[PDB]
Assembly symmetry: C3
Homo-oligomer: 333 residues x 3
């Protein structure tokens, strides 16, 4: 690893993923990243509810880091003095020392640099895990995805090549916002004051909200995902704490690695797939119809009532072969 | 599609499935179906609890529609003037326009006809999804299965032929019945009056009941499923809203497509499989022993306390090789 | 079966598994086991909470029984007169008579002997299932694993041999301990007195505790699992009632049968896998780094708050290639 070339990557905010190659002729590199932790109060719904949040790089989820199998990930993790809590990082893509958590314990005003070999292909959760407060830091927003692509790109069950033309990254967050005796959500002046009440809600195992990328409606309106008929999209879906069941309304998972590990053959033609709490999964879909799709958790209560739903706006020409309105709604004859 | 022969299918009520071929020499057809929506109050347990229900064809689940890969499904959806709500249909087996929901919005007194290409094999959920009230219509009973068989029938992982001699369809429904201050379930005079209280219960994510085919004990007693030793049964299991884990007590899933998509290899020898909320799965089993089996959700609280369990009564000759009582219960020597 | 040699196996307490061969030259045998039911009050957490528990062989989970495909399992099940309840056993690995439950109904002071053919490879749940009180007996602790190894040992997806050097068995138990009006957990003088209040908690679907092997911290401290760099461990994980998502922190599932059935190809490189309620799954991992790992349910609330977490202490030499601390935590420059 000390023999290898280094490259530095500039991360981009979700739902985008930083530019990268799929299949590559390049040999292994030490790939350098930096992330800066930001604790902040965030508004998470349409009625002004707040979360005392904790983030990698100021976003929920943290940005997606992309490397190739055999690369080394070298992350500089910075915890500014403006934060109140200690933090670290646990990469599910890494081997040893609790995913790196034991080697990256950073108090406010500190930083650390971790290297690990990305020797396994797939999408992998990374998350903060400070001793004694692991679930709180995770549910407050400290998670994201490391994608380790096979050096020769994605493959179908027969070993045929697969690709995407655009990648989107979706972090789904089960949130545990306490209420006061009046039945309204509590607003806390500081992160520390949210702790005890939040642990109580967590223990009920019932989320108050479940959101994609930090807020109800985050991936809707001006912020909807986009694509065009004929384009293949990769949808990366991470859930660091709780199970979810992604579904594309009007579409499918053409090829899905629901457990998120690319050396395994994908399943095809899925209506709904399953992302285990503590994992990231990946689905490919090639659009065949224009229009606005929903991409959601298909516990429809969790989607429509709690917030786990987004939109994809797709340009192109309608295909009557695939679907046709034979008779529009009209009075019963 | 406008070049193809049409066939008309008469649907049958669950747990049966309408007559159909598995492997077929027939070429693609436009296959015509009709369904009529019925809103109605239904008794869902042994103590007289009622649900303000919403159904396709008067049953929970709606009937199963069976076609072959490459067929076109052409459904006439009728919403009689006797109903209070608008409805539509979203086929997970279809491509575009939110599964067809955008093209089938029917007010009471209206009907519509949708065609789509069944270009993907598997069992697929269909459900109502009216804008702004999706989860309510789904949990109140508006879902069923479309089965798209491969034109050459089912195949094992080695591409060997598989078949069933009888098919049963099981819709599992997580119900959200409100209680009054006395702790008894509420009875509502109309469907609209159930709405607000039901949304409140839904948001708790805790079902009051979880039932197969519309009621506790629906598939028991005179209404138990039946088979004989040597017969292979297909068990189609749909859950449009919530995860379930089917299990056959005293049996197995000989071949299971838990994600329900037939172009993927099935798993064998399963004790319990997993149906993701928002999907239908399929299991084959060949009976080897006579007797009464239970078929249930193996969260045993959900099965025995909440209602997610049925029976299969199986005729035939007992096999001592497979199982033998060496010593009957007797005092400890 | 009446032609075959008999062998008698002495069971060992979890987390160990009794000595056995993987690949074997031996032909089919009738393999004889005995288990004795013990009802007892157990302390399940650090603050003195008790469970009115029910066990096979005095442990949660019951011991793991290991045979080979084609063997016959012959179990003598003893219910001493010191117990208050009737019991039986349902083997998911068996065919007929509700898994054997119908043939093993034992009142206190009775015993029975059941034989069945272990004709399917995999890890399979066994559990008590007395008519009318199935979920209570299961959640109070009456479950364990039967492992049926293929006669030629484990195989990867290409049919290559796989093995483990040490096997551990983990039973995960969702517990439903009632509270009194003071908010403290209730202590019951007898098993029967716990029943009504416990059913009420069960029906909420919210566990008060979720524990590995009978208690918070059961697999920690002096009781941590152990291994060494270079050693391959099999981790058997059973959950007879509720879904879980195992994860090894700092490690992976090198080869995983999450549905637990060895005739299916395993998945590789898993971060987190899924054990369906009512099943046992199996994961292989070869340690590459020394240190203390956590093995946990990756709903991190369920793990850290409710108790579903253990430790593995691993001896050996650190590998800087796999992971290196480039810069230790230090002030931001
Ligand atoms: Cu943190
Ligand atoms: Cu983790
Ligand atoms: Cu409707
Ligand atoms: Cu849907
Ligand atoms: Cu028992
Ligand atoms: Cu069972
Ligand atoms: Zn204050
Ligand atoms: Zn009224
Ligand atoms: Zn008493």
């Amino acid at each position: 690893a000390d023999k290898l070339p280094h490259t530095k990557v500039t991360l981009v905010a979700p739902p985008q993923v930083h530019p990268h190659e799929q299949a590559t002729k390049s040999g292994p590199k030490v790939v350098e990243f930096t992330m800066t932790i930001e604790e902040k109060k965030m508004v998470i719904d349409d009625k002004g509810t707040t979360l005392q949040a904790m983030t990698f790089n100021g976003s929920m989820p943290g940005p997606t880091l992309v490397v190739h199998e055999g690369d080394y990930v070298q992350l500089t993790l910075v915890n500014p003095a403006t934060n109140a809590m200690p933090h670290n990082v646990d990469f599910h893509g890494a081997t040893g020392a609790l995913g790196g958590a034991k080697l990256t314990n950073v108090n406010p005003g500190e930083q650390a640099t971790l290297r690990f070999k990305a020797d396994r292909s797939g999408t992998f959760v990374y998350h903060c895990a400070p001793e004694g407060m692991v679930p709180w830091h995770v549910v407050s927003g400290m998670s994201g995805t490391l994608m380790v692509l096979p050096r020769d790109g994605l493959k179908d069950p027969q070993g045929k090549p697969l690709h995407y033309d655009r990648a989107y990254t979706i972090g789904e967050f089960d949130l545990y916002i306490p209420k006061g005796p009046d039945g309204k959500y509590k607003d806390y002046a500081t992160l520390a004051e949210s702790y005890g009440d939040t642990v109580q809600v967590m223990r009920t195992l019932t989320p108050s909200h479940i959101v994609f990328n930090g807020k109800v409606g985050a991936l809707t309106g001006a912020n909807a995902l986009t694509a065009k008929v004929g384009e293949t999209v990769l949808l990366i879906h991470s859930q660091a704490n709780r199970d979810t069941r992604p579904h594309l309304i009007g579409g499918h998972g053409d090829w899905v690695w629901e457990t998120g590990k690319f050396a395994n053959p994908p399943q095809r033609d899925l209506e709904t797939w399953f992302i285990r709490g503590g994992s990231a999964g990946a689905a490919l879909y090639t659009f065949k119809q224009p229009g606005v799709y929903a991409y959601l958790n298909h516990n429809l209560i969790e989607a429509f009532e709690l917030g786990a739903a987004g939109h994809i706006k797709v340009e192109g020409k309608w295909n009557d072969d695939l679907m046709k309105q034979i008779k529009a709604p009209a009075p019963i004859p």
